[PDB]
Write a protein that binds this ligand. Sequence first.
Ligand code: CYC
Ligand code: CYC
Ligand code: CYC
Ligand code: CYC
Ligand code: CYC
Ligand code: CYC
Ligand code: CYC
Ligand code: CYC
Ligand code: CYC
Ligand code: CYC
Ligand code: CYC
Lengths: 50, 69, 162, 162, 163, 162, 162, 58, 172, 172, 172
Amino acid sequence: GNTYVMESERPATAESQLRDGRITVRGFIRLLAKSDTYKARFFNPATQTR
Amino acid sequence: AITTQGKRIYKITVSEAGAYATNKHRTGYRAPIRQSNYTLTVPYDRFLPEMIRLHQSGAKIVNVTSVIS
Amino acid sequence: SRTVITEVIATADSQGRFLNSTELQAAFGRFERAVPAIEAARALTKNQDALVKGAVQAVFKKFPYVTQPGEKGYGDSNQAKCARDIGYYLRFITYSLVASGTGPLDDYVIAGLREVNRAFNLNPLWYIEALNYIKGETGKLLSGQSKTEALLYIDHAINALS
Amino acid sequence: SRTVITEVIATADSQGRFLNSTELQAAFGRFERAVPAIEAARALTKNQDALVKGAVQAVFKKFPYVTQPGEKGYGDSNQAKCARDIGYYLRFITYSLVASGTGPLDDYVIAGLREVNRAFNLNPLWYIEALNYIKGETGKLLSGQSKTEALLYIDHAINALS
Amino acid sequence: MSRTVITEVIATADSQGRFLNSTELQAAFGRFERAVPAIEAARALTKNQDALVKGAVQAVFKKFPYVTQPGEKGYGDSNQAKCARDIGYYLRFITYSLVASGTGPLDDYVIAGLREVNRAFNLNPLWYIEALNYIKGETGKLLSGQSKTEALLYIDHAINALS
Amino acid sequence: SRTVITEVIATADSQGRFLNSTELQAAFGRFERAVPAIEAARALTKNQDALVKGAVQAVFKKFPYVTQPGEKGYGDSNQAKCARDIGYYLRFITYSLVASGTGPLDDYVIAGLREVNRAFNLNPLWYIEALNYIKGETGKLLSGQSKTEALLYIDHAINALS
Amino acid sequence: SRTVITEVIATADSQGRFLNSTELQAAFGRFERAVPAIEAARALTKNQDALVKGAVQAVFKKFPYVTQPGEKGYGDSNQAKCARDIGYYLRFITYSLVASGTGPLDDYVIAGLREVNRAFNLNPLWYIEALNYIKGETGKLLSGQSKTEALLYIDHAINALS
Amino acid sequence: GEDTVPFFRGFTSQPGQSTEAFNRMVTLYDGYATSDSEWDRGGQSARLTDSLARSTMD
Amino acid sequence: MNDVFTRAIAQADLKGSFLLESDLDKLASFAKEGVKRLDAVAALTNNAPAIISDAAHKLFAEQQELIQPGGNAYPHRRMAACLRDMEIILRYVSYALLAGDASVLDDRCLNGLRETYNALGTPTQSVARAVQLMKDAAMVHLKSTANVTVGDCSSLYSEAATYFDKAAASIA
Amino acid sequence: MNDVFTRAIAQADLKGSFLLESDLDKLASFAKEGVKRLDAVAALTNNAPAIISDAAHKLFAEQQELIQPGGNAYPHRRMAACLRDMEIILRYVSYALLAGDASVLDDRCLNGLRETYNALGTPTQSVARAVQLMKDAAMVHLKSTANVTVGDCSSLYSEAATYFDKAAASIA
Amino acid sequence: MNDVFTRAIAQADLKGSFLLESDLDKLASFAKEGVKRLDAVAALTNNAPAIISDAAHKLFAEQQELIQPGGNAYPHRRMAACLRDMEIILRYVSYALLAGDASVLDDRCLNGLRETYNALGTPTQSVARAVQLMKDAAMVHLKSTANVTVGDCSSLYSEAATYFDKAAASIA
Ligand SMILES: CCC1=C(C)/C(=C/C2=NC(=C\c3[nH]c(/C=C4/NC(=O)[C@H](C)[C@H]4CC)c(C)c3CCC(=O)O)/C(CCC(=O)O)=C2C)NC1=O
Ligand SMILES: CCC1=C(C)/C(=C/C2=NC(=C\c3[nH]c(/C=C4\NC(=O)[C@H](C)[C@H]4CC)c(C)c3CCC(=O)O)/C(CCC(=O)O)=C2C)NC1=O
Ligand SMILES: CCC1=C(C)/C(=C/C2=NC(=C\c3[nH]c(/C=C4\NC(=O)[C@H](C)[C@H]4CC)c(C)c3CCC(=O)O)/C(CCC(=O)O)=C2C)NC1=O
Ligand SMILES: CCC1=C(C)/C(=C/C2=NC(=C\c3[nH]c(/C=C4\NC(=O)[C@H](C)[C@H]4CC)c(C)c3CCC(=O)O)/C(CCC(=O)O)=C2C)NC1=O
Ligand SMILES: CCC1=C(C)/C(=C/C2=NC(=C\c3[nH]c(/C=C4\NC(=O)[C@H](C)[C@H]4CC)c(C)c3CCC(=O)O)/C(CCC(=O)O)=C2C)NC1=O
Ligand SMILES: CCC1=C(C)/C(=C/C2=NC(=C\c3[nH]c(/C=C4\NC(=O)[C@H](C)[C@H]4CC)c(C)c3CCC(=O)O)/C(CCC(=O)O)=C2C)NC1=O
Ligand SMILES: CCC1=C(C)/C(=C/C2=NC(=C\c3[nH]c(/C=C4\NC(=O)[C@H](C)[C@H]4CC)c(C)c3CCC(=O)O)/C(CCC(=O)O)=C2C)NC1=O
Ligand SMILES: CCC1=C(C)/C(=C/C2=NC(=C\c3[nH]c(/C=C4\NC(=O)[C@H](C)[C@H]4CC)c(C)c3CCC(=O)O)/C(CCC(=O)O)=C2C)NC1=O
Ligand SMILES: CCC1=C(C)/C(=C/C2=NC(=C\c3[nH]c(/C=C4\NC(=O)[C@H](C)[C@H]4CC)c(C)c3CCC(=O)O)/C(CCC(=O)O)=C2C)NC1=O
Ligand SMILES: CCC1=C(C)/C(=C/C2=NC(=C\c3[nH]c(/C=C4\NC(=O)[C@H](C)[C@H]4CC)c(C)c3CCC(=O)O)/C(CCC(=O)O)=C2C)NC1=O
Ligand SMILES: CCC1=C(C)/C(=C/C2=NC(=C\c3[nH]c(/C=C4\NC(=O)[C@H](C)[C@H]4CC)c(C)c3CCC(=O)O)/C(CCC(=O)O)=C2C)NC1=O
C-alpha cells in the first residue's frame, strides 16, 4: 500500500530462493505475507474489516 | 505447519496433459503458455489443494516424492 | 510434537536469521520449566491405571444415560475403548508436559477432533467430565510448578474438547 | 517496538486464539529476567557520560586520521555529533535491556541504518569500534546476569552493524 | 443473497462474462414446472402446522425424556415455549425453501452458524434430528407424489446439515 | 465436453459436498429434454444431402458477387469443400442436439474460430446466411419442442460466428 | 550476460509476439554504436598494464593510511590481488563495451557486491577510486564517442560500487 | 498467473465484477503517495464499510 | 473428461460420420433410466453419512492395527484422512455413476492416487477393503425403498459394481 | 540463450584474457553488416502472416488426412494449434536469426518442445517438412527486393537456410 | 523439523508407552545442561559473522583458482552464493545445536542441497572443507570463556562436532 519497505526488513533467504526458482512468484508472495512486518503494517494497527 | 505433520514437504512433478491444455485454451491464455512438464514443491499443509486445483485444471500428476522422510 | 525450541527455530527459519535475545530467553525459560513438568508427567504416569478407572466411573456417574445396555457408552469392547482413550489422553498430557508445550497434545489429539467425534457420535461432554476427574485427582497429586503446569495442560485439552 | 509480551499478543491474535501455557511461561521468564536487566539499566544510566567519552576516545585511538581536517572526525561540531550519536545508541541499548529484547533498538536505529551510512558515508566500523569499547568497559562496570544480557544486546547491535 | 436456481444461474452467467445459454433457460423452465408441486407441498404443510409441532414436541420428549427431568436444561415452561418456537421456525424455513425450490433460504437462515449455536448452548442436534424425523414421518401421509419427495429432500438436507 | 451434467460434475467436485437438489433437478430436466432433441437430430440426419446442398446454393444466391472469379470457393473442388464444411457444421448441430449442450460446438468449432477465419480469409457472414437458410427450412421440418431447441442451438451457432 | 538484443528477444518472447519497430531500432543503436566501442576496446586492450599499475599506486597514494604495515594495504599478496582485481574489472569493462551493455560487467562483478565488500573488509571506495584513476587515464587515451561510452560504463561500475 | 506480479486491476472492469468495486477503489487509491502505515490514519479506518453496507440491501 | 453421451459422440466424430440408429436408441434408453440412476445417487448422497459410518465401523472392527499405537490411522489425524479418503472415493464413484463414464473417474486422481499412497506408505489393500465396504453399505442403502415405488435396479447395481471394482483396481 | 556477441564474450571470460584483435574484427564485420540482417528479419516479420497462410495451403494440398476426421489437426482448435505452432517456430527462427546464434533457440524452445511434441504424438517428420514449407515461403519473401536498396545477402540466405534446417532437424 | 524431546515423545507415542523415568532423567539432564547449550549457541551466533569471514578468508587462502577465472565461484554472483550458502549452513547447524537434535537441520537445510550442487556442477568437496572450517572457527570462538562463567563443554563440543560432521556428510 505504498508504504516504504525499509531495506533491513526484507528476508534475504526468501528472495534468494525465488532467485533459484524453486518457488513461483506466488509462493514468494505467500512467504512475504507471512512476514511479521506485513502484519505490523496492516494487521497490527487496523481493524479486521479495514 | 510447525507441527510434525506440517513438515515433510512433498515434491510434485506436474505434466500438462491434453485435458489441461484443452481447458486452458478454452478458458483463455491469460497467462503465458508454459511447458507441459514442471516440478512443484508442495508441503503437507497445502498438499491436497495442489492436486485438487490441478485436477479441476484437467492436469494429472506425473509422480510425487517426499522431501522429508 | 511441539517444543518452545521448535517454534523458535521454525520462526527463525521463516525469517532465515539467527536467534536474538528473545529466542534465547524463551529457550532458557522453557529449560527451567522442564524439570517440574517432568515431575508432573511422572506423577501422572505412576497413577495411570487409577486415573483411567476413576475417569471411567466418573463418566458412569455423571450421565445416567450412558451405561444402560444398547447405548454407545455401554459395552465391554466399548469400555475397553474408553480405557484406551483415557490412557491416550493422559499419556499425551504427559507428553505435552515433557515438551513443556501444548504441541504434543495439540497435534496428537486436538487436531482432527471435532469432525471425528461427530462422525463417530462421540459426546465431547464425556471427555470433558473424564478430564474433569483428571483435574480433581491431579490437583491432589501435585503442588507448585508441576501442579500448575499439569492443570494448565489438562485445561487446554478440555478447552479443545469443549 | 517488539517485546516478548508484544510478540505473544500478536501471535495469539494471528491464529485468532487466546493465550496458552507456553506464552505465559515466556512472560514469566521475562518477569524474572527483568530484575537483572533493570539493574543493568541503572548501571548504564549512572555511567552515561563516561561511556560516551570513553567510546569517543577509543575511536580516536583506533581512528585518529578521521579527526584530520577534511575528514569526518575533524570539527568540534562533528565530534559533538559523534558523542550525541553514541549516546543515542547507548540509550536505545538501555531501552533494549529494559525491553527484554531488541524491539526499540531495531525500530529506532536498525530500521534504516545502512541507508544513512551510505548517505553520509558513516562507516559502520566506527560504531563497531565504539560498541566494542562499550563491551570491554561493561566487562568491568557489570557482572553476571546483567553483564551477559547487556553484552548480548550490544553485540547484537554490533552484528547488525557488521 | 439467498442461493436458488435462477439466482445461481444469474451469478454464474455474470461470472463467465456471458449471456444465458440453453442450459440456464432449460433449468429455469424446470424450476417453473417443478414449483407447482412445491407450492402444493408448502400449502399442505402450512395447513396442519399445529399437529406437526405438537407431535414433534411430544416425540422429542419421548426419545430422550431425561432432558425433561428437573435440573436439566429441557425442564421448564420457558423451555417448552422455546422448543415450540424453535420447531415452528424450522417448519417456517422448510416451507420457505420448498417455495424457493432451493436450500438457500435454509442454508443462510439456519445452516449458517448453527453448529456454534449447538456447541455454545449444549443443544445436541439429536433432539432436532428427532423433530425432523417426526416431521418426515407425519408428512409421509400429508403430501403425495412429487411434493412428498420434494419436502423429503429439503428436510433431509436440514438433517444432514444438523448431522 | 461441458454438457449440462458435465458442469454439474464440475460444480460438485470443485468443493467438498455431494450433489444437492438443484443439479439433480437440472439433470432430470435435461433427461426429458433428451427426447424432442433426439427426434430433431434424427429428422435432420434423414434430410442430410438436400439440405446441405440447398444451403450451398443459398450461399451462392445471397452472395453472388463472390461467385465470379474471386470466390475462395471458385472451382469445383472449392464449392465441394463448401458443401463439406456445411456438412461438418450439420454434424455438429446434430451432435449438440443429442448432447443437450453446446459441447460439440464450443469444443471443436467455436474453439479458436475467429483467428482461423482471419488466417484463411473466410467471411463468417457466408456461414451465417447458410444457417439462416437452415432457419428457413427448420421452421417447417421440425415442430414444437424439437423445433425450439434446434432453433436455439443454431441461434447460439450464429452468435458464435458473429 | 545480456546485450540490448537480449532484452529485445526476452521481451518479444515474453509477450510471445513478433518484433515491431522499437526493438529493431535498438538493434540499429547497438550496430552504429558498436564501432566507437570497438576502438574503445582496442585502446583498453593496448593500455591495460599501466592502467592497473597506476590504479595500484593512486589508491595507495590518496589512501595513505592503508599502505603502512598492520592493515589491508600492507602485504604483498594484497596488492597482487589488487592488480588482478583491476585487470578483471577493466576486462569486464571491455566486455561491456563489446556487448554495448552492462550485461557482462553487471552479472560478473556487480552481483552481490555489497555483502562481499563488508564480508572481507575490502572498502569499496578503494575500487571507486581505482575506477576514478581509470577515468583519469581514459580521459586522455580515448577520444570522442569511444571515450563517451567507456566513461559511461566505468561510471555505472562505480555507481554499483557506490 | 503463477508468475505474474499482482497489480491494481481496479479502474478496469473485471469479468463479472461489481459496479461498486470501481467506486470503492477510486475512493481508496487517491494517488501514488497514499501510504497505509500506522500513520496517516487512513489505513486504520475502514473507508469501504459504509459503501459495503448498501450492497446487502436495495 | 467426457460423459457417456459425449463418449458416443466422440466415437461418431472419430469415425467421421453421423451417429447410428442403435446408438441413438441406447442413448434414449439411458435418458429414460436416468431417472433410476438419479434416484440411486440421490439416495447415496442422503445415505452417504450412514454408508461411511457403517463401512468405517465395520473396518475398524475387523482390524485393530490402525488404532493401536503407531498405526496407519492411530494419531487421530491419519484416521481422519482415512474417513476423508473413503468419502471422496465414494463421491467419485457416484460421479461416475451419474456421468455414465469411467474415463472421467480415471482422470480424476486415479492416475495419481496409487503412487500417492505408495509414497505415503499407506497400505493400498486397506483402501480397497474400505472402498468395498462402502460399496456394500451403498448397495444396502440403495435397496432401501422408502417412500418410493419399485422399479428395475439390477443394471444400476451392475454399473455400481463395475465402477467400484474399477476404483479398487486403480487404487490397488 | 546467447548471441555471437555474448557467446564470444563468454569465451573471452573463459580464457580469462582480453578479446583478440581478430575477434573484435569479426565483431565489427557482424556489426557493419548487421543492418542487412535487420532488414531481413524486418521483412520476415512483415510478410509473416502470408507466409503462414500459403505454407498452410501447401500443407493441406500435399496431405488430406489431417483435414479428414481423426487428423492431428482435424478439430478446428487442433489445426489452430498447428497454425500457431508454425507461427511460433518461425518466430524463434527470426529471434535466433537476429541474434545470429542458435543457442537462444535451443535453450528457450527445444528442450521442452521435444518432449511436448513427442508426447502429443504428432508426426515429427510432418512438422519438419512443414518447417521446410515455412523455409520455402520465407525464402520467397526474403528474395523479395520490395522497396529496399539492392545489395548482396547470399550469406544471410545461407544462414537463414541453416536456421530452418536446425529447427526442422531438432523438431524431427 | 523437530528436537530430541519431540523424538522421545514420538517414539513413546508410536509404541504407546510413556516416557520412562530414565528418559525423563536424561531429558532433565539436557534441561540443566540446556543453559550450557544456549551459551554455546550464543557464542556461535555472536561470532558467526566473524567465523564465516575468517573461514572464507582462509578458504580463499588455500584455494586461489576459485576466484581466478574459470572457477566455480569466479563471477561475483557465484562467490557471493558461496558466502551466503556457507552462512546458511552455519545458521541451520546452529538451529540443530540449540534444538539438541539433528533432524531439524536435515528436514529443511540438508534436504535438497546435494542434488542441486550435483546438477550445477558445484565442487561439493570444497563445500565440505568450508563446513569443517566452520568447525575450526567455531572451536576457536566457543572455547573463549571470557565474560562468562567457566565449566565443562565437552558435551557441546561433541554435539556441534556431530552437527558439522553430518552436515559435511550430507552435503558431500
Ligand atoms: C525503419 C528503420 C529503417 C530501415 C529498416 C531502413 C532501411 C536501410 N537498410 C540499410 C542497410 C542495407 N541493407 C541492404 C540489403 C537489402 N537490399 C537487398 O539486397 C536485400 C533484399 C535486402 C536485405 C533484406 C542494403 C542494400 C542496404 C544499404 C547498404 C548500402 O548499400 O550502403 C540502410 C543503410 C543505407 C544508407 O542509409 O545509406 C538503410 C537506411 N532505414 C530506416 O530508417
Ligand atoms: C511514489 C512516489 C512517492 C511519494 C509521493 C512518497 C511520499 C511518502 N512519504 C512517506 C513517509 C515519510 N516521508 C518523509 C519525508 C518528509 N517528512 C519530513 O518532514 C522530511 C523533511 C520530509 C522529506 C523532504 C518522512 C520523514 C517519512 C516517514 C514518516 C513516517 O511514516 O513515520 C511514505 C510512506 C512509505 C512507506 O514507508 O511504506 C510515502 C509513500 N513516497 C513515494 O515513493
Ligand atoms: C531455502 C534457503 C536457500 C538455500 C538452502 C539455498 C542454497 C542454494 N545454493 C545454490 C547453488 C550454488 N551454491 C554455490 C556455493 C558453492 N559453490 C562454490 O562457490 C562454493 C565452494 C560452494 C559454497 C561453500 C554456488 C556458487 C551456487 C550457484 C552457482 C552460480 O552462482 O552460478 C542454489 C541453486 C541456485 C542459487 O540460488 O544459487 C540454492 C537454492 N538457497 C536458498 O534460497
Ligand atoms: C491416539 C489418538 C486416538 C484417539 C483420541 C481416539 C479416540 C477414539 N475412540 C474411538 C472408538 C470409541 N471410543 C469410545 C469411548 C468414549 N465413548 C464413551 O464410552 C466414553 C465416555 C468415552 C471414553 C472416555 C467408545 C465407546 C468407542 C466405540 C466406537 C464408537 O461407537 O464410536 C474412536 C473411533 C475409531 C475407533 O478407535 O474404534 C476414536 C477416534 N482414538 C485414537 O486412535
Ligand atoms: C535516531 C537517533 C539518531 C542517530 C543515532 C543519528 C546518527 C547520525 N549522525 C549524523 C552526523 C555525524 N555522525 C558523525 C559520527 C561518525 N562520523 C565519524 O567522524 C566518527 C568516527 C563517527 C563517530 C563514531 C559525525 C562526525 C557526523 C557529522 C558529519 C555527518 O556525517 O554528516 C547523522 C547525519 C545528520 C546529522 O546529524 O547532521 C546521523 C543520522 N542521528 C539521529 O537522529
Ligand atoms: C537469557 C539470559 C541468560 C543468559 C545470557 C544466560 C547465560 C548463563 N549461563 C549460566 C550458567 C553457565 N553457563 C555456562 C556455559 C558457558 N561457560 C562455559 O565455559 C562456556 C564458555 C560457555 C558454554 C559454551 C557455564 C559453565 C555455567 C555455570 C555452570 C552450569 O552450567 O551450571 C549463567 C549463571 C551465571 C551468572 O548468573 O552469572 C548465566 C547468566 N543465562 C540466562 O538466563
Ligand atoms: C468441423 C471443423 C471444420 C471447419 C471449421 C471447417 C471449415 C474450413 N474451411 C477451410 C478453407 C475453405 N472453406 C471454404 C468454404 C467457404 N468458402 C466459400 O466462400 C463458402 C461461402 C464457404 C462455405 C460455407 C473454402 C472454399 C475453402 C478453401 C480456401 C483455401 O483452401 O484456402 C478449411 C481448411 C482445410 C481445407 O482446405 O479443406 C477448413 C478446416 N471444415 C471443417 O471440417
Ligand atoms: C569476477 C568477480 C570477482 C571480483 C570482483 C573479484 C575481486 C575480489 N578481490 C578480493 C580479495 C582482495 N581484494 C583486494 C583489493 C582491495 N584491497 C586493497 O588492497 C585495495 C585498495 C583494494 C583494491 C582497489 C585485496 C587486498 C584482497 C585480499 C583480501 C585479504 O587480505 O584477505 C575479493 C574477496 C575474496 C577475499 O577476501 O579473498 C574479491 C571478490 N574477484 C572475482 O573473481
Ligand atoms: C430430483 C430427485 C428425485 C425426485 C424428487 C424423485 C421423485 C420421483 N421419481 C419418479 C420416477 C421413479 N423413481 C423410481 C425409484 C426407484 N425405485 C426403486 O425402488 C429404487 C429404490 C429406486 C432407484 C432406481 C421409480 C420406480 C420410478 C417410477 C418408474 C419410472 O422411472 O418411470 C417419479 C414419477 C412417479 C410418479 O409421480 O407417479 C417421481 C415423482 N426422484 C428423484 O430422483
Ligand atoms: C484429488 C483427491 C485426493 C485424494 C484421493 C487424496 C489422497 C491422500 N491421502 C493422504 C493422507 C492419508 N490418507 C489416508 C487414508 C488411507 N489410509 C487408511 O488406512 C485408509 C485404509 C485409507 C482410506 C481409504 C491416511 C491414513 C493418510 C495419512 C498418511 C500420513 O499422514 O502419512 C494424502 C496426503 C496429504 C493429506 O491428505 O493429508 C493424499 C494426497 N488426496 C486428494 O486431494
Ligand atoms: C514454449 C513455446 C511453445 C511451443 C514450443 C509450443 C508447441 C506446442 N504445441 C502444443 C499442442 C499442439 N500442437 C499442435 C500442432 C501439431 N499437430 C498438427 O496439427 C501439426 C502437424 C503440428 C503443427 C505444425 C496440435 C494439433 C496441438 C494440440 C494437441 C491435441 O489437442 O491433442 C503444445 C501444448 C499446449 C499448447 O501450447 O497448445 C505446445 C507447448 N507452443 C508454445 O507456446
